[PDB]
Amino acid sequence: AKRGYSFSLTTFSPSGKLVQIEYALAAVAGGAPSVGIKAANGVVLATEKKQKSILYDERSVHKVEPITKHIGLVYSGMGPDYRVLVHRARKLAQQYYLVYQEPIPTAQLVQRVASVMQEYTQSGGVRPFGVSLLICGWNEGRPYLFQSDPSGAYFAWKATAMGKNYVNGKTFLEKRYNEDLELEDAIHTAILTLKESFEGQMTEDNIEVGICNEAGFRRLTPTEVRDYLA
Amino acid sequence: MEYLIGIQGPDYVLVASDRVAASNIVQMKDDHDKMFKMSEKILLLCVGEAGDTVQFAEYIQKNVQLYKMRNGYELSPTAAANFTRRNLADCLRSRTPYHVNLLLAGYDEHEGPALYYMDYLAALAKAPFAAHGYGAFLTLSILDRYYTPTISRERAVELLRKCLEELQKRFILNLPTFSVRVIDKDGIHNLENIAF
């Protein structure tokens, strides 16, 4: 028999800073690098999927996940916490569709998912999520890219990077990224930003990449990743 | 079976209610008041089930008074009527519903004189004139006949006179006395009770 704690594990310090959120921000900042780019006619999301051993089955688990027909997810930080947010976001997407009979606007999903992240910064007996989410989507004939973080705050991006070397990844994108890209060009600059922080040689198994357009969201097959790696 | 009536003018609302408190076949009271003071310019007249009327009417009365204390100003005749409608409609699909037929009369400083009709089903409708009870079937035609939206207070009491005389002649129930009150710019004024 058990009964949970009813007191907040995230409190205000004398400085006025919620320490556990910034500590959760350290968990994502130390995780594997991820990059997202909004490119006029579509969105691309890419991440480092280096399992650091040849024993692993690279096909079993995925980091780039679909939420619905038109929305995808990538993360930096902890895998287990990310899974919870995926399952919650998939349910929120269906809850919206059952009520309105319309594919959920990306901005509306991120708002609903970020609100779940907010709970774990105030609710009793729980720690915040150690994950920053990268949400892509297509609705009203327009590409969307969003960032959700442990705080529960959300930001809209043209292009951004998170995880290891997120500071060097962003400055790279400031110079490299230009508006009005083609989707196929966006995959290149996504892998290029990922190469800046890699360490090792890139194979189609070492990285994972998903794309979102007017035809919906899908993860690129290992054969498709190999062709861009040249 | 009881009787309510309201007549709205250009700058006033005239309301009247019978003074009979009846049980089975006996008249227990000759001077029972069926009017409830909600605000300085709001009156609620209630009719229906014996115990349900007073309990419901006072509950709304005390909540309109609660609003006055919490804010420093009173509810508008419209906001008051919509509040009473909300409370009755929420009890409609419950285990214990209130079988009350009511008539809300008020004066707003902006909109002016107001008169609201409401079912026991809780359907709200604004009317230039309305009547509750079985006596309405005998009086609504007289109201339809002589009513003009520019009726003076002198003529309004005389029109009420014509309606109450009809209840003495044709209506099978004995309703000899009526409470008569007028709401306007200055508030609620107690007017001479019409006896037969």
Partner: protein
Amino acid sequence: TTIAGLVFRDGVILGADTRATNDSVVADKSCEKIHFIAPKIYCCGAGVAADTEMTTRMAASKMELHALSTGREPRVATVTRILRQTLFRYQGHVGASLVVGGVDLNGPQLYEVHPHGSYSRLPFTALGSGQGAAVALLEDRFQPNMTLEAAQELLVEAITAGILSDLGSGGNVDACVITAGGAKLQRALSTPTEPVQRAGRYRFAPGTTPVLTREVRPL
């Protein structure tokens, strides 16, 4: 409402009419009684229209969620069980009689499920007000391993039978064909009745209608 399911060699075919009746009067002459559940699983709904719609959409939503977590093509056997248990919980108060058909790793499957929660698996079935007519045709002209084209024709015939014979059945016949390669939904596959033609023109010269009040808000 006449709905039918047929199992053939390459897959399954489902049929429905398009008539929705309120009271004993026709409200919709063109409604969709074949419901999306999974890309390769569809369900035919008869009973209370709202119930069939919502129960179906619920299943479809759950099935998508299942597919997402599983990462695999959903099973029709899974859909049937989901439906049963939900419907059983409500003791037949959710008026949904359904024909669910789909293709699996396990092949083509046809199920019928009743509002009380009973299910049965079979090569062919018909549900709804016009089921008698449709079952009659299938019982008469059904052979196992029918070619798709023969199956298409028989199903149409079966549902057509319901349209003409039943008063609560009418409109066009919709068919949905499910094969391992694909699922082709054919709306208005066949239309037995077309009356567009009217002999009189009931038009009114502007001003015929007497207006007391006019108000126009520009935007």
